[PDB]
């Protein structure tokens, strides 16, 4: 039956999926270049049969190409997936065996966490630093022997970042007021 | 029922509590585990012409409401970041679109607060530079390590001055 919902921010919820098989459902995403995230969820009307779950796929025609985004289950009946990166795209939902889904690997870049904003900035801050500062990095063997010339060890970046991750994992709001 | 409400990872709720002829409420248990909430129109009942929906969030402390954003006929769905400010509430108030136009949502789909995230970026920048600066060493004081790379301290300072200057002009210039 009709057990799935598909949502793109700014548009109306889709609840009528084309059934391309007994265990497969497909939504169309028109003008998908505009879309960063998709919300896929169970309608709450029909649960997954025993031992079953949902494998969520995305497809952009080039012909099609199905990339595994993640999963939807009875205990986790909704998810937000990032579509950015990878006119009419498709969202596919395959009803699979749970033990089969357990051996599948969804593409990284698809998962959305409560920490993405903080992680994205910090990584881009350090990348920005690297691209700028590494052009000036030198080994000791390469230095013009100036006794008072000040330097900063490059490996402080990794030590700061590793510390940042530990602090972020323990509390995403360690920095707040 | 006119609206749908979804905490990402949980089951969608579609049975809003009408508390007034123009206001609707969803109850959300355990808000400490709530990160993303999706509020949308079911597509059964549209707003009357000239009206829209202002979405508010309340968290206990004692209940304080906050403007998350809007859902309208023009934009029938919206995603809101919640983590960052055990039962919370999503409130949907039917308002004039002209009234909603002068309201300022604290939130965003990516961050709970535009101003709190600005504070985050500024603190991370300062914390990183402060940490890195601490290890400043003159060539006279360096202990021989052939496989270590060193950055000129003035280059590090220049990057820091550049980054905060650029972060000021456009807080999202990095992305």
Curated annotation (Swiss-Prot), chain B:
Q: Does the keyword Nucleus apply?
A: yes
Chief location category: cytoplasm
The impact of changing residue 120 to A is:
Decreases nuclear import activity of HSPA8. Does not affect the dimer formation. Decreases binding to HSPA8
Domain of life, per the record? Answer: Eukaryota
Matching InterPro entries:
Hikeshi-like_C, Hikeshi-like_N, OPI10
Task: Name the UniProt key words of this record, in alphabetical order.
Answer: Cytoplasm, Disease variant, Leukodystrophy, Nucleus, Protein transport, Transport
> What does the record note about the induction of this protein?
Following heat-shock treatment.
Q: What is the effect of changing residue 56 to A?
A: Reduces the nuclear migrating activity
Q: Name one Pfam family in it.
A: Hikeshi-like_C
Record carries keyword tRNA processing: no
Outcome, altering residue 75 to A: Decreases nuclear import activity of HSPA8. Does not affect the dimer formation. Impairs binding to HSPA8
Region spans: Required for F-X-F-G repeats-nucleoporins recognition and nuclear import = 19-56
> What subcellular compartments does it reside in?
Cytoplasm; Cytoplasm, Cytosol; Nucleus
Of the GO CC terms on this record, one is: cytosol
Q: What does the record give under GO molecular function?
A: Hsp70 protein binding; nuclear import signal receptor activity
Question: What's the family?
Answer: Belongs to the OPI10 family.
Q: What is the protein's quaternary organization?
A: Forms an asymmetric homodimer; required for binding and nuclear import of HSP70 proteins. Interacts with ATP-bound HSP70 proteins. Interacts with NUP62 and NUP153 (via F-X-F-G repeats). Interacts with HSPA8.
Q: What else is known?
A: 'Hikeshi' is a traditional Japanese compound word used for a firefighter, smokejumper, or troubleshooter.
Free-text function comment from the UniProt entry: Acts as a specific nuclear import carrier for HSP70 proteins following heat-shock stress: acts by mediating the nucleoporin-dependent translocation of ATP-bound HSP70 proteins into the nucleus. HSP70 proteins import is required to protect cells from heat shock damages. Does not translocate ADP-bound HSP70 proteins into the nucleus.
User: What's the name of the protein?
Assistant: Protein Hikeshi
Q: What is the lineage of its organism?
A: Eukaryota, Metazoa, Chordata, Craniata, Vertebrata
């Amino acid at each position: 039956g009709s057990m799935f919902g598909c949502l793109v921010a700014g548009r109306l919820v889709q609840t009528a999926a084309q059934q391309v098989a007994e265990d497969k459902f497909v939504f169309d995403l028109p003008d998908y270049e505009s879309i960063n995230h998709v919300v896929v969820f169970m309608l709450g009307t029909i649960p997954f049969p025993e031992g079953m779950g949902g494998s969520v796929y995305f497809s952009y025609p080039d012909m099609p190409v199905w990339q595994l985004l993640g999963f939807v289950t009875n205990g986790k009946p909704s998810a937000i997936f990032k579509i950015s990166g990878l006119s009419v795209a498709q969202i596919g939902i395959s009803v699979e065996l749970l033990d089969s889904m357990a051996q599948q690997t969804p593409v990284g870049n698809a998962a959305v966490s409560s920490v993405d904003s903080f992680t994205q900035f910090t990584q881009k801050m350090l990348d920005n630093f690297y691209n700028f500062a590494s052009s000036f990095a030198v080994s000791q063997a390469q230095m013009t022997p100036s006794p008072s010339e000040m330097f900063i060890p490059a490996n402080v970046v990794l030590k700061w970042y590793e510390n940042f991750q530990r602090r972020l994992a323990q509390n995403p709001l360690f920095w707040k007021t």
